[model samples]
Target: HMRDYICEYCARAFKSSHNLAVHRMIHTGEKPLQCEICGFTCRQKASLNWHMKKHDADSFYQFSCNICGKKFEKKDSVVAHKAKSHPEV
Candidate 1:
């Protein structure tokens, strides 16, 4: 039977032998953790240490202003915003 314990960081359950080994690291602060590529530092020896992927590319920088519902990625995009909102000026 699996012993009862949980991962504090992610709140995931683990079996005793595995959980005990991992839990000890938290107390000792002995992170033998490393990334295979860039060797980025981390407390846990998990796959997340790989700093290969660029998260910025996955983000949506093109935001639509709620005040006028204008879509823009930069201040220049406000040209369309001004044209639409203040057509007389």
Candidate 2:
């Protein structure tokens, strides 16, 4: 596979010019996508979309570990914390 599009900043090659353009954000620090609620900026729109979910309190929960009182965003995180922190329980 030939990657003709090369980044001038880092010499990273990509098959598509669009992908190279996206890669340029790493060196340029250009964030075109901006979040309206928190003014958070990101290079990709998908990351911005993921950030939007944090604003949704109806779905989000203050999941906490029963053993240690550590907080998390979801029950799965608490489960992982229990597996690592309270394996004996």
Candidate 3:
């Protein structure tokens, strides 16, 4: 049986050290993706793609918090804000 290794911070387990090392990036705040337009970086290619929308003249920040009607450029921002500020929700 493959003995799964656990992360010290979030306690996510890995089947191998290689997997754990990659998982460590989450806690380490490692972002390898870069934006060609503004020299911005993100953790994933999808995040970069989402950020690209903010660069367009006609595009709008679409992820909204119904609690406050505040819009964010990305969905992740909305979730984090909701978890922290919207206790009633």
Candidate 4:
């Protein structure tokens, strides 16, 4: 009963209007999180953080995809890639 704020585009409901607004961005194709240097836009702050690290020369890539042998800086990135590319895993 706490999730009262409902999305007009989807059946999902949020606990707050702020969160519902954020969720609405997905359906509206809104990218509020932007990269300061290159002007790259992202929906999530974590994506922006990862994009910022790409601008760094000393950035490390420790997370590896088990199926593709591809390396990423974050574990969630690998998890997302695996889910999209290797769904059977």
Candidate 2: residue 10 lDDT (0-100): 68
Error of 1 at 44 (Å): 8.5
Q: Which ten residues in a row are the worst by lDDT in model 3? A: 53-62
Candidates 2 and 4, the one with greater lDDT = 4
lDDT of 3 by residue, 1-89 (tens): 35777777664676876556554654655525566655555556888676666543214445666456577777777668878888885
Show the colliding residue pairs in model 1: none
lDDT of each candidate versus the true structure: 0.45, 0.61, 0.61, 0.62
By lDDT, the candidates rank as: 4, 2, 3, 1
Models 1 onward score TM values of: 0.26, 0.34, 0.30, 0.35
The most accurate candidate by TM-score is 4
Candidate 2 lDDT, tens digit per residue, 1-89? 36678876565567886666564655646536666655566566788777655543212345555555567787777677768877685
Top candidate by lDDT: 4
Error of 4 at 2 (Å): 8.3
Ranking 1 against 3 by lDDT, winner: 3
TM-score of 4: 0.35
Residue 74's C-alpha lDDT in candidate 4?
Answer: 74
Clashing pairs in 3: none
The TM-score-based order of candidates, best leading, equals 4, 2, 3, 1
Residue-level error in angstroms, candidate 1, position 8: 10
Per-residue alpha-carbon lDDT of model 1 for 12-78, expressed as tens digits? Answer: 6666644444445445455445444333444554444333221112122444442344456754565
Q: Write one digit per residue (lDDT tens) for candidate 4, span 36-59.
A: 655556557899788666543224
